[PDB]
Design a protein around this ligand. Structure first.
Ligand code: CL
Ligand code: CL
Ligand code: CL
Ligand code: K
Ligand code: MG
Ligand code: MG
Ligand code: MG
Ligand code: MG
Ligand code: MG
Ligand code: MG
Ligand code: MG
Ligand code: MG
Ligand code: MG
Ligand code: MG
Ligand code: MG
Ligand code: MG
Ligand code: MG
Ligand code: MG
Ligand code: MG
Ligand code: MG
Ligand code: MG
Ligand code: MG
Ligand code: MG
Ligand code: MG
Ligand code: MG
Ligand code: MG
Ligand code: MG
Ligand code: MG
Ligand code: MG
Ligand code: MG
Ligand code: MG
Ligand code: MG
Ligand code: MG
Ligand code: MG
Ligand code: MG
Ligand code: MG
Ligand code: MG
Ligand code: MG
Ligand code: MG
Ligand code: MG
Ligand code: MG
Ligand code: MG
Ligand code: MG
Ligand code: MG
Ligand code: MG
Ligand code: MG
Ligand code: MG
Ligand code: MG
Ligand code: MG
Ligand code: MG
Ligand code: MG
Ligand code: MG
Ligand code: NA
Ligand code: NA
Ligand code: NA
Ligand code: NA
Ligand code: NA
Ligand code: NA
Ligand code: NA
Ligand code: NA
Ligand code: NA
Ligand code: NA
Ligand code: NA
Ligand code: NA
Ligand code: NA
Ligand code: NA
Ligand code: NA
Ligand code: NA
Ligand code: NA
Ligand code: NA
Ligand code: NA
Ligand code: NA
Ligand code: NA
Ligand code: NA
Lengths: 237, 56, 73
RNA sequence: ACGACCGUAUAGUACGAGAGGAACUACGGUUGGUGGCCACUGGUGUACCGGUUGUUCGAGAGAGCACGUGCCGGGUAGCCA
RNA sequence: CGAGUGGCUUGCUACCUCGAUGUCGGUUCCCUCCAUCCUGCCCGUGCAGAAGCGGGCAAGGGUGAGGUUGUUCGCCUAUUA
RNA sequence: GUCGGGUGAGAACCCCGACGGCCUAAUGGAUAAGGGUUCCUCAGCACUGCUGAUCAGCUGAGGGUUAGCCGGUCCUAAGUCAUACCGCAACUCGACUAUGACGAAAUGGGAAACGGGUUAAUAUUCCCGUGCCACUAUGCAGUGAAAGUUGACGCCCUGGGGUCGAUCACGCUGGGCAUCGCCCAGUCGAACCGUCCAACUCCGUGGAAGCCGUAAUGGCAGGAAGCGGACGAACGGCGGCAUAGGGAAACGUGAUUCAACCUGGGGCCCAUGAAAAGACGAGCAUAGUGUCCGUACCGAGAACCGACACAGGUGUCCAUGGCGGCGAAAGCCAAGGCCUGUCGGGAGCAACCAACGUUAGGGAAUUCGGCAAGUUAGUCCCGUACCUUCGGAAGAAGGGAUGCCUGCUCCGGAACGGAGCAGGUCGCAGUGACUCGGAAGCUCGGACUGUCUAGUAACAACAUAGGUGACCGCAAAUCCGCAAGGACUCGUACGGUCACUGAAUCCUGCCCAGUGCAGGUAUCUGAACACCUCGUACAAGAGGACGAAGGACCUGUCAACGGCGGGGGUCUUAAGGUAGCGUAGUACCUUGCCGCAUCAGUAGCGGCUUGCAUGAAUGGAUUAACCAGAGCUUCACUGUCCCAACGUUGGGCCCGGUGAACUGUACAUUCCAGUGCGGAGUCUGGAGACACCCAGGGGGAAGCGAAGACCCUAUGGAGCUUUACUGCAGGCUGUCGCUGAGGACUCUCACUCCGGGAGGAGGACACCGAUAGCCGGGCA
RNA sequence: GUGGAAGUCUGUUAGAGUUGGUGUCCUACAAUACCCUCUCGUGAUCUAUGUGUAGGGGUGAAAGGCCCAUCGAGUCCGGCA
């Protein structure tokens, strides 16, 4: 047969690549020598092409100008602060240790210094549950309990743009446009709508997968399609 | 649209050009590589044992 | 509202469109001052035509249920 | 190169209890086929004449174009049914 | 039950063509066969007449229009000698 | 095209005049690519030119392209290359990271040029006149000088300013017509220098509690209007340029609508609409310099691609010439271009064919089917059903009006803008041509726009929003690579990967036995290393102990593959079809039965339905809108038909010129029979037959065209599939090496990751190398 | 009343496509053309120029479509007599 679509992707040709050149900024927390003294002002609120959510322009004291992963409720003129002694208000960043348990956070570092990895998309937020001198327990948007070094810096509040997912695209044309700002091939052709030579589900007088859709974790690429290592399917039970 | 005659009309692009190195009109000006001597790809001249019969 | 969709798309799709965009287009009370002169500038971007205060809020609403739970905690 | 039918007289007769109901022959017509012809009716008739829209020749007069007549109205001959 | 004729149906056979003999129906146009549906002449009748039924000679001429169906066939309608 | 005329040995087609036409987003004007001398001139006709040629894109020889201020050049874009690094057996190979360079001639950014003249041929390049930029030098000014601005930007609506053009009014200049007095053309004048400034922003004054303002949104005691001021625009006005230029002459003035250009307001995004060089910021005089490359012509029904002077294909600018009209529409006509979509002559010009007009009466009877053709048509008023997702259906349907002329009214600042009124009047006909819907109903499918088999399929197929399931916390899931490495990713679960169903609406039952996936698992099974026993002075080898993933075994799971029967009042194999829908685009029997409709209805629609062999995301039912989708009916319509006729144009036929191809074993004037490998112009018997030629429609040559696509045969081929055979990648798992200290554990030192570093996490695992078992159509 | 939304409608504006005529052509004008008719025509739109992806590999709103008249595995040469 021929390689299936999931195999073409990995090559990274234009069609599957993100329009990087069109993106604005790689949102990451600032690096502070220490002290926390680093503060700045919100100069402007812009639209982030890569995330379809708002992004704040900030001017720091030492002249640095950089775009920031913005928490709901930040506005022009506001002052943010980044450090161990940063105030505890929305838009500010400081280690989970200095943060008060029970508060909504976002853009949480997986390891101190990485600049933030978790909870960064539209309207999401992590939940700081437990403290300690060794482990800071956080509940990520998926619901999973994540154990994190208390040194990991995070931002206070919930990411901006909440409620996006609420309104339907209503028409292909809309998806189209959204999908053109993303490293994805759109539209998508159902595998059962292809030929045998093109996809494990292709072929047949009528449209139905040949074998059962749940496939093994060990199935190799080219064959791993359908319901991947599904622990169950359906809705019953 | 016919792949034949009608599709022949749009052919006004320039690709292969007189080669600075070999003098053959094979220097692809878009690839900047010669399909005949390999100028722009190989310091050595493009040459293959299959350009002639096995025992010759 | 949804009427620009004519007889297309279905009840649920366009009803949610009118709903979201009616709240979306309602008069909003600005955070800085108190005036209801807040309008959406783009996806998740709001401003007040009165004093110009540009804010970060929901996508279709300037405040989200979760943005409010923040203020408290 | 003619085939066949219908109608009238025969006759409400022969026959028959009645009901009903022929024929030979003489007539008229129709239908299909056939060959030919255009006085007559009908079609065509970008021969022809008129009406009229748009535009061009300044107007008027008189004209060109609008597909092989702009359109509409009428139509000789001839060819036709 | 027994003897046949035809070569329209169907099957059997594998002789003819696989360096191709263009498929089904229809249509258009031509010639033919008789095992005759009508038309001409006859015989019989369980032939009064009228209308039939059966049979004989006879292929000159005729055998048309429609509704469903791709249909051949066939079903159905109204005319029809 | 025609009549004259010119040239020439020779003229239908070369040139001149007249008349007659063709092209109006092109058949005009300017160009990109591409061609490459095709451009111009002179001399020619052996070649090329669908005929001819004195002509030519042909042949020959000469000549022709001039730039500081038009392009290139410079910059950066997607992205490309080189060198370094690393990988690879290796490279002309390969990804990352660094550095450098490349990457835009119509159409990205961009220092600076206008008018006129001139040549056979160039021209913002030469010449005349006038102007401008950059750099350098001298001189005066200046210490400012880099912050900032600019370059620099999406889609939709819209206001204001405003040139050309067009039109209107009037004058002047030139011309046309000649029943009037009308009609046409012109009436010019740059870059540049100077100057003016609406809009936006802001300042002072002022002090609105309801006013201010718009086409619309809107503004305001956080200070409205008004008033005064700062900043501030055009390719615009005005002056200069200019007793420059140009014109035979006049060498105008006002106005409206206003492309270019300038400048504002509003709306939209699950979409956010380049960058860099350069410019400004940052004065003036005088002088010098401003190299290099491109510049001809075509730009297409003859200069490009398509073998051709090919009816094909091929980007940009002119979108403001007049009448007309809603219009960048039709039709007519300018300017400009052309008679080269390049063979001609003749016959009332037959048959037949291509395009087409018209046909009485009938009116779909034609046919698979109304295919084709026809009908309707523009604008206004009146009026408008079922159904519906309330959007729509809808221009439903149906009905009425429609010109010209005379005099007016209303809106508006006005239009050479728009809406109405009265009276008069001609025709068969007033959207008079042209332009310009036929209408209504039932059923199926797919919801919709969208996509597709370049070249027989446009569909019900694909996509889609919407619904659902699965995997994953980022050193992830998924995917590429031999590796070095990489996409997803400037991304982080409101994410993005992998699949199914396919808008809305009402819904979506039962089955985990098999298969698949996932988890668990006392016990069983389960490879190699290391270990123990036997054996061998060692080794092979035989056996044991221990046992990972996997499997047995159990559990979960159907919006996972799929299934939902026979029998009786349970059996196979887990369950035994629920809501619906049903003679289905699924129904064998079948033209099912009943009804509707018709003279007659294997069709259609409705009801029934035991469904050969319907049914729920293998989605079920249903459904407004939509549709070059499939079937059916009605009104209207008509040469589709009855049944054909006549006519128009181009062929056809004759003549001059040009001039192929298919096909051909031979013979050949055949016909009726027969015979023959059973489908004969050629054999046999008879019949017929004087030879040659023209047209015709094609009966035969099993006519020509293609070593039959169907079928079978070959120990043929290829693509595809799987629990076919054998292998391969890949995933999981044990073991060994890297690898270190004190059947469960701590540590840190290798190694890995995070951090700019300090340092933090992890850690003898992981990665990587070797091997062993399992899975293994992803691949061979 | 204003406003002017829309994968909105009509539309040979330009432009894009290709439903029917199973017309013309079928040794063509053309190795996919001509004409009439018809679909789309502010958007998932069309287009020029540049640029990326290469052969069991691309690209594919999926037709086994397309990758220079070549596609169920391009073309060239070689293996190869
Ligand atoms: Cl999305
Ligand atoms: Cl140029
Ligand atoms: Cl405004
Ligand atoms: K055969
Ligand atoms: Mg990033
Ligand atoms: Mg969703
Ligand atoms: Mg929308
Ligand atoms: Mg993309
Ligand atoms: Mg799909
Ligand atoms: Mg398919
Ligand atoms: Mg496969
Ligand atoms: Mg399906
Ligand atoms: Mg299916
Ligand atoms: Mg091709
Ligand atoms: Mg005429
Ligand atoms: Mg034959
Ligand atoms: Mg007889
Ligand atoms: Mg006879
Ligand atoms: Mg019939
Ligand atoms: Mg010349
Ligand atoms: Mg000459
Ligand atoms: Mg460059
Ligand atoms: Mg440019
Ligand atoms: Mg010239
Ligand atoms: Mg030139
Ligand atoms: Mg020509
Ligand atoms: Mg008639
Ligand atoms: Mg009929
Ligand atoms: Mg039709
Ligand atoms: Mg007035
Ligand atoms: Mg009309
Ligand atoms: Mg559809
Ligand atoms: Mg096709
Ligand atoms: Mg279609
Ligand atoms: Mg088609
Ligand atoms: Mg579909
Ligand atoms: Mg989804
Ligand atoms: Mg979906
Ligand atoms: Mg029925
Ligand atoms: Mg049906
Ligand atoms: Mg179910
Ligand atoms: Mg003989
Ligand atoms: Mg053969
Ligand atoms: Mg076969
Ligand atoms: Mg094979
Ligand atoms: Mg790292
Ligand atoms: Mg295989
Ligand atoms: Mg539309
Ligand atoms: Mg349209
Ligand atoms: Mg391109
Ligand atoms: Mg197929
Ligand atoms: Mg080739
Ligand atoms: Na299949
Ligand atoms: Na017999
Ligand atoms: Na037989
Ligand atoms: Na043969
Ligand atoms: Na036939
Ligand atoms: Na007879
Ligand atoms: Na019949
Ligand atoms: Na000629
Ligand atoms: Na000026
Ligand atoms: Na006009
Ligand atoms: Na559309
Ligand atoms: Na099961
Ligand atoms: Na199971
Ligand atoms: Na079923
Ligand atoms: Na369509
Ligand atoms: Na006719
Ligand atoms: Na013949
Ligand atoms: Na194959
Ligand atoms: Na309104
Ligand atoms: Na067509
Ligand atoms: Na290949
Ligand atoms: Na070979």
């Amino acid at each position: 047969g021929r390689r299936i679509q999931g195999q073409r992707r990995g090559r990274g040709t234009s069609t599957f690549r993100a329009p990087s050149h069109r993106y604005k900024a790689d949102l990451e927390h600032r690096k502070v020598e220490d002290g926390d003294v680093i503060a700045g002002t919100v100069v402007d609120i812009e639209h982030d092409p890569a995330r379809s959510a708002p992004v704040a322009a900030v001017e720091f004291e030492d002249g640095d100008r950089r775009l920031i992963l913005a928490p709901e409720g930040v506005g022009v003129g506001d002052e943010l602060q980044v450090g161990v002694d940063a105030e505890i208000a929305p838009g500010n960043t400081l280690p989970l240790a200095e943060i008060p348990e029970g508060v909504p956070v976002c853009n949480v570092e997986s390891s101190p210094g990485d600049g933030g990895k978790f909870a960064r998309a539209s309207g999401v937020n992590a939940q700081l549950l437990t403290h300690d001198r060794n482990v800071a327990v956080v509940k990520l948007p998926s619901g999973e309990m994540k154990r994190l070094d208390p040194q990991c810096r995070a931002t206070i509040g919930v990411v901006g743009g909440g409620g996006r997912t609420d309104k339907p695209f209503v028409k292909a044309g809309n998806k189209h446009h959204k999908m053109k700002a993303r490293g994805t091939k759109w539209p998508n052709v159902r595998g059962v709508a292809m030929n045998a030579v093109d996809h494990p589900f292709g072929g047949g007088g009528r449209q139905h997968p040949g074998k059962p859709k749940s496939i093994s974790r060990n199935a190799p690429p080219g064959r791993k399609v359908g319901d991947i290592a599904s622990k169950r399917t359906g809705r019953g039970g | 649209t016919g792949a034949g005659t009608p599709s022949q009309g749009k052919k006004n692009t320039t690709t292969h050009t007189k080669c600075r190195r070999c003098g053959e009109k094979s220097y692809h000006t878009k690839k900047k590589v010669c399909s005949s001597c390999g100028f722009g790809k190989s310091a050595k001249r493009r040459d293959y044992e299959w350009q002639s019969k096995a025992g010759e | 509202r949804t009427g620009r969709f004519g007889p297309r798309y279905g009840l649920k799709i366009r009803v949610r469109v009118a709903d979201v965009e009616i709240k979306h287009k309602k008069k909003h009370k600005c955070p800085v001052c108190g005036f209801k002169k807040l309008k959406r500038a783009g996806t998740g971007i709001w401003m007040c035509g009165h004093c110009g205060y540009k804010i970060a809020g929901g996508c279709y609403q300037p405040e989200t249920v979760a943005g409010k739970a923040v203020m408290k905690a």
